[PDB]
Amino acid sequence: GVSRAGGFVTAPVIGAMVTRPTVPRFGMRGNSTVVSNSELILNLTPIALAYTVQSLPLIATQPAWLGTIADNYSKWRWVSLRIIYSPKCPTTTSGTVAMCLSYDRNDVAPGSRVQLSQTYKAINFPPYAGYDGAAILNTDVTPTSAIYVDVDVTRFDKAWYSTIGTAAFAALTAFDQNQFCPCTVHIGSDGGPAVAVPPGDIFFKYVIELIEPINPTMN
């Protein structure tokens, strides 16, 4: 790379992904139903000078489309969960966007980018970057220029989680939420322009295993 052999860098006016059209794929693994799909989950708050954060609980019901399928199953577990960033602003946008993971709903969100950076899986990056890694979303490859976070799905506290709707989940105390949620992602930013600029969006690319069907009304 440039840090060993030297090189040169250039920058275009702007760059962005074009998402490949797809359909959620279903599969059976014995009595288990496996769903593989990608979903746009969040539009980030316009990046400005001051710091700001957004958080999302990583539960089966968070992605709206998957959420529906989950209502018919009692338990689930993430087989793989990759959080991907997609820029939507020009290379003239100053600032830094960062993401990280937490595992206790009683936690307080990172109050600054320094706090966020000390945390697990923290990745800091310019708001305009990430387009070169489009393949991470459209294919199963992992480009080195892609901006993403892989969740340590094998290091959760429980083996399976019970399905719960987002509204009901929201109404729980942090402690009761802990029983239905294995992890939460935080996305923060700062150092942006005086006139805030929408930086990018967040996608979830996942493979989930759902078990033990249940009447949706009961669940």
80 assigned binding-site residue: no
Instruction: Tell me, residue by residue from 166 to 195, as one string, x for binding to a copy of itself by CB under 8 A and - for no binding.
Output: --x---x--xx-xx----------xxxxxx
State the nearest-atom distance from the C-beta of 46 to a copy of itself, in Å. Answer: 7
Residue with tokens 């840090």: 3
State the nearest-atom distance from the C-beta of 167 to a copy of itself, in Å. Answer: 13
213 contributes a contact to a copy of itself by CB under 8 A: yes
62 contributes a contact to a copy of itself by CB under 8 A: no
Q: Using CB distances below 5 to 8 A depending on partner kind, what does residue 204 bind out of a copy of itself, Ca ion, none?
A: none
Phi first, then psi: what are they for 155, rounded to 5°?
-115, 35
Nearest to 56 by CA among 77, 32, 39, 68: 39
Query: Letter for the amino acid at 197?
Result: V
104 assigned binding-site residue: yes
Question: By CB under 8 A, what part of segment 122-161 binds a copy of itself?
Answer: 122-126, 128-129, 131-135, 137-139, 141-150, 152, 155-161
CB-wise, 187 or 190, nearer to a copy of itself? Answer: 190
19 contributes a contact to a copy of itself by CB under 8 A: yes
# chain residues binding a copy of itself, by CB under 8 A: 144
State the nearest-atom distance from the C-beta of 187 to a copy of itself, in Å. Answer: 14
Q: How far apart are CA 183 and CA 185, in angstroms?
A: 7
Among 11, 80, 166, 170, binds a copy of itself (CB under 8 A): 11
Question: By CB under 8 A, what part of segment 69-128 binds a copy of itself?
Answer: 69, 71-72, 74-75, 86-96, 101-104, 106-126, 128
Residues that bind Ca ion (CB under 5 A): 37-38, 104, 122, 162-163, 219
Q: Which residues pair with 98 in a beta bridge?
A: 124, 188
* Residues of the binding site for Ca(2+): 38, 104, 107, 117, 163, 219
